Design a protein around this ligand. Structure first.
Ligand SMILES: Nc1cc(Cl)ccc1-n1ccnc1
Ligand SMILES: [Cl-]
Length: 404
């Protein structure tokens, strides 16, 4: 009956482990060691300038974030003089890094998280996975399953949510490996991804750096702290509420092709302290399963049309030949919307998300039963609507489904 009661308060703020729509890549074309790749990426940019804070972290020590970035640059400059470029780089345990590495309450839905989700559904001009990326099969797959995987892949291989998948897989792999290979060190860990242009060129991408703290992770739940430093062209002063947890530097200027001619835009560095655990880094390494999970949701839809029409409906589904249209607009957009929901469930995982997902499915089945044939549950759901952007956006969406 009643729409969900969304909490009131200041707008919700970004809480992902890395930047999503706001990320910026420094890239090298047709390039294997992350630190060497990062330096060559840094040396493609010439608009660096003396960094200063432009959006302070309200609760943190902003001079230390500034000092940490200047330390990163200074220590990368050192590596450029040591004879062979080493495989890894352990930061000096400066006072700013010791500080930064660490050695109720209601928020309202803000529009940025819907925007993030729309962005995750879009196509980029690069492919982020190989043609045989999806799946774990010991054996050759049957002909129909293959056809389905190939159709699905063509629709998501360039999708932005797939870039998020591989970005997350890379940085979680690197952090987890560093966590046992360099337990006592403040290791400098580049944030790298890899894609292939439409013309087939291989590109290596640098988003920024993380620095991990001490990581004596005896448990799955033991926490390793880190400082993330991420490039961006997003001016934080347009949506300051999004950036509550960040100190934001201006660190350069970049010359860009636009719908106008060439333009110069400031380049920013989003800095925050964060943490993660073994168990979260292991899930982060498994994000390719989002591809598999959303494929299987698509296969479900094909199997239902295929039993009803007593023929295999794979070609007629993906080619859009019973239904007379596709509400999202195209088969492609449906695949990418399913993918983005799955990826965002992983990026924004939480107990709030878990509680909302189960209790809201109960209210949905009940409400459909009422729709087709005509207190307590509401408290379990709304006990999860506190301050998480992804949960709040999903509750917003649920209320659309209640109005329709
Ligand atoms: N320090 C540094 C290191 C690298 Cl690999 C690239 C650029 C710089 N740099 C120069 C001026 N501002 C920053
Ligand atoms: Cl997989």
């Amino acid at each position: 009956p009643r729409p969900l009661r969304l909490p009131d308060g200041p707008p919700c703020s970004q809480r992902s482990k890395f930047l999503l729509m706001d990320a910026l890549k420094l890239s090298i074309e047709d390039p294997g060691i992350p630190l060497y790749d990062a330096i060559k990426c840094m040396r493609t940019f010439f608009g660096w300038k003396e960094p200063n804070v432009v959006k302070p972290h309200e609760k943190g020590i902003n001079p230390n974030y500034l000092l940490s970035w200047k330390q990163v640059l200074a220590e990368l400059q050192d590596i450029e003089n040591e004879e062979k470029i080493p495989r890894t780089k352990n930061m000096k345990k400066t006072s700013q890094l010791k500080w930064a590495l660490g050695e109720p309450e209601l928020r309202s839905l803000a529009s940025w998280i819907q925007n993030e989700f729309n962005k995750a559904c879009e196509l980029t001009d690069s492919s982020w996975i190989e043609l045989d990326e999806i799946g774990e099969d010991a054996a050759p797959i049957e002909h129909i399953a293959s056809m389905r995987r190939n159709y699905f892949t063509a629709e998501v291989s360039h999708c932005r949510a797939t870039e998020y998948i591989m970005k997350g897989v890379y940085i979680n792999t690197a952090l987890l490996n560093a966590s046992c290979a360099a337990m006592d060190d403040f290791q400098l860990i580049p944030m790298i991804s890899k894609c292939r242009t439409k013309e087939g060129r291989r590109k290596t991408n640098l988003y920024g750096f993380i620095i991990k703290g001490r990581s004596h992770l005896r448990n799955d739940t033991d926490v390793v702290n880190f400082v993330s430093m991420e490039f961006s062209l997003t001016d934080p002063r347009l949506e300051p509420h999004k950036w509550e947890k960040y100190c934001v530097l201006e660190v350069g200027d970049m010359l860009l092709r636009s719908a106008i001619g060439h333009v110069s835009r400031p380049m920013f560095l989003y800095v925050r302290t964060n943490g993660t655990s073994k168990i979260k880094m292991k899930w982060g390494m498994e994000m390719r399963r989002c591809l598999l999970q959303s494929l299987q949701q698509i296969e479900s839809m094909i199997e239902a049309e295929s039993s009803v029409k007593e023929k295999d409906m794979t070609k007629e589904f993906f080619e859009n030949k019973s239904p007379k249209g596709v509400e999202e607009g195209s088969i492609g957009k449906v695949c990418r919307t399913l993918l983005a929901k799955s990826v965002f469930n992983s990026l924004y995982a939480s107990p709030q998300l878990e509680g909302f997902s189960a209790e809201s499915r109960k209210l949905l089945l009940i409400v459909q039963a009422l729709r087709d044939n005509l207190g307590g549950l509401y408290e379990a759901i709304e006990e999860c609507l506190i301050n998480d952007p992804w949960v709040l956006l999903n509750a917003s969406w649920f209320n659309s489904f209640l109005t329709h």
